[PDB]
């Protein structure tokens, strides 16, 4: 369990911990799920928290989050993210692949925005974003 990995999981935790108080509540999980277009019932929220809430106090602290995330062992989050973008797995993110992710995550797009995004990331000028370019941009 290296210090580098623990830091990456801390950053992930902070995307859920809306008040920064070090715990994830059902309300905070529900807020994130709704911003992604999902609408879990308050009972599904409680059951997701419960499967992770080792001490039974009803909220998820960082050690409990770390246990959940550790169990699955996947690759580093940044490699995981690249695979989401590069759906055909050839090691390059195309304009069509970037449009797909933007659409799936509910981000409005224009062709000129997408071209400028690739252009900013595209160090070698081949018209696509490879892994090295992706990591440097992110």
């Amino acid at each position: 369990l290296t210090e580098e990995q623990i830091a990456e999981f801390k950053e992930a935790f902070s995307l859920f911990d809306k008040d920064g108080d070090g715990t994830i509540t059902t309300k905070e999980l529900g807020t994130v799920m709704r911003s992604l277009g999902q609408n879990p019932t308050e009972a599904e929220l409680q059951d997701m928290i419960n499967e992770v809430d080792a001490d039974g106090n009803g909220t998820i602290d960082f050690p409990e989050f770390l246990t959940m995330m550790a169990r699955k062992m996947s690759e580093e989050e940044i490699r995981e993210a690249f695979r989401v973008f590069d759906k055909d797995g050839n090691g390059y993110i195309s304009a069509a692949e970037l449009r797909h992710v933007m659409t799936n995550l509910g981000e409005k797009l224009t062709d000129e925005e997408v071209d400028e995004m690739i252009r900013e990331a595209d160090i070698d000028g081949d018209g696509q974003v490879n892994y090295e370019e992706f990591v440097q941009m992110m």
Binding site: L15, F16, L29, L36, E51
Partner: peptide, 24 residues
């Protein structure tokens, strides 16, 4: 400058992947 859009997507993708973990 479009780095903010890339970073917004990365943040949303990470939240989505953690939610998937909670669903499992």
């Amino acid at each position: 400058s479009k780095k903010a859009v890339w970073h917004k997507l990365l943040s949303k993708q990470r939240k989505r992947a953690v939610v998937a973990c909670f669903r499992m």
